[PDB]
Amino acid sequence: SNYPAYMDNYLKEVINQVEEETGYNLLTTGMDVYTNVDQEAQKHLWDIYNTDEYVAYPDDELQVASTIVDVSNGKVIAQLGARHQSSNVSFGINQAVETNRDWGSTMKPITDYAPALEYGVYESTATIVHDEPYNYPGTNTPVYNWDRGYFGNITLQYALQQSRNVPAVETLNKVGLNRAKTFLNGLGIDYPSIHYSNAISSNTTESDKKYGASSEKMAAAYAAFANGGTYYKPMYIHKVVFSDGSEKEFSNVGTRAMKETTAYMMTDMMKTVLTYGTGRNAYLAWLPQAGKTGTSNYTDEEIENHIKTSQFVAPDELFAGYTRKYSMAVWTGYSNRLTPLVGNGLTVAAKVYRSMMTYLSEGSNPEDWNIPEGLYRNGEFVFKN
């Protein structure tokens, strides 16, 4: 024995964060490290992943990777990048932190809508947007919705709820690429160069751990919504003790990335995603929470030469939700993007989220968010004073 299997991923990042911070590799240098991982939470997550006691998987090769963050300090309390993957070699690639996969629509809240309300492009969640034939700015390439259809004049909250692409890209045009990119920096996310395609895709040209999105980064980002607009750099360690006796404490300093009002508005709209939208498989009548779903697609080449079914398919299915205490981003798909997620497999990400959040909150007495000063309700929407 050396270390349990369920901590492989977590321990991998600890080694790295200590390395980045102090500059020493604890595998060749004696140190005592106190981490933020919630052992019991980890264990439970592992069972959700590797057992059939919580979620019905279509098979054992389907993958999952998620990260749970404490929205009050950015501490990563649980993380796991793969399931039923026992190719024992320690600290292999941890998918929870890799930004090689597309997070689709989970990018809409932080890349289009948050910035819009933040910068005054929209004054309320009732604002009327446009889901009509529309081409990517500066091109004749059309922006398609999954059903290749259009709802026309719908409200901001409804556009998000049903995850309509047109309104999202259009919104990104009104917000402006440069400040949309600056707004993501406030949430830890960045691209080499941002493009309109990023209004609904995290797909980027350069492949680094920094560019794009990963469960790790998405959770930290959404944590900002939950706590009122403050972004905390994800942390795996909070203290290390060198063999000499001197110690190092790591601070959870948070930076405001959006107004208190913007956060409440985004949150308000995102809970309707779980109630009447795409994220209905993660809904809990007793838990005040909000989230967003995402589905990536296959290229034409892929659909014709590699996809052998007429069933709705995708290489990636994602969910990123949060309660008032915890933020969790989930990723699902196969190591080989060419193996699609089908029917039952697509509900996996949401259900994995629901199971974990149940575990983390059913015991406590969860509180809701309170309408901050500067906004007022009016039936189903929220407006600025």
């Binding site: 270390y3 140190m31 981490t35 919630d38």
Partner: peptide, 16 residues
């Protein structure tokens, strides 16, 4: 070289 690692409840979880 040996490095002990603890969780958030400050209880040992690994030694490397």
């Amino acid at each position: 070289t040996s490095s002990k690692i603890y969780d958030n409840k400050n209880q040992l979880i690994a030694d490397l």
